[PDB]
Design a binder for this molecule. Structure first.
Ligand SMILES: Cc1nccn1-c1ccccc1N
Length: 147
């Protein structure tokens, strides 16, 4: 079939085939094109009441539900994909991570350093590709592979 991690899917609303990556939670209409020692990523984190540390520079007590966090992530993904908003702008304004002040940049990293779902998505993204919602003990991430 297609590159590993990817599967064919059917749009429930249009009937048109699309492609879904179960490692990055990315989805796209085009058939996907197709590992490095290190990747560089940015991310936009939305925490929730069950986050390992439910606090952030935005909010001393994060109280939103996981469902509310996922809805916020979904909305940010929509605006990034439509081009109304840039990833970096939304990360700076709304990421519950200290990296928000760096437009979400986390720098480069190897396997072994980040939380596993984040690492797997990061290394499965192509350069310049953005993830779907990625879930970790920290909360819910939108990941952008920059290198
Ligand atoms: C995938 C999903 N849909 C609604 C809520 N969540 C969710 C959010 C955070 C952690 C786990 C889960 N299941």
């Amino acid at each position: 079939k297609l590159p590993p991690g990817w599967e064919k899917a059917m749009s429930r609303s249009s009937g048109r085939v699309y492609y879904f990556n179960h490692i990055t939670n990315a989805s796209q209409w085009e058939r996907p094109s197709g590992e490095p020692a290190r990747v560089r990523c940015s991310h936009l984190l939305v925490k929730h009441s069950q986050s390992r540390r439910p606090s952030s520079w935005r909010q001393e007590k994060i109280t939103r539900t996981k469902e509310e966090a996922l809805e916020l992530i979904n909305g940010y993904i929509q605006k990034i994909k439509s081009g109304e908003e840039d990833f970096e702008s939304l990360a700076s304004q709304f990421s519950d991570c200290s990296s928000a002040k760096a437009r979400g940049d986390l720098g480069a990293f190897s396997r072994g350093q980040m939380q596993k779902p984040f690492e797997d998505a990061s290394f499965a993204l192509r350069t310049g590709e953005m993830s779907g919602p990625v879930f970790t003990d920290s909360g819910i991430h939108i990941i952008l592979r920059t290198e």
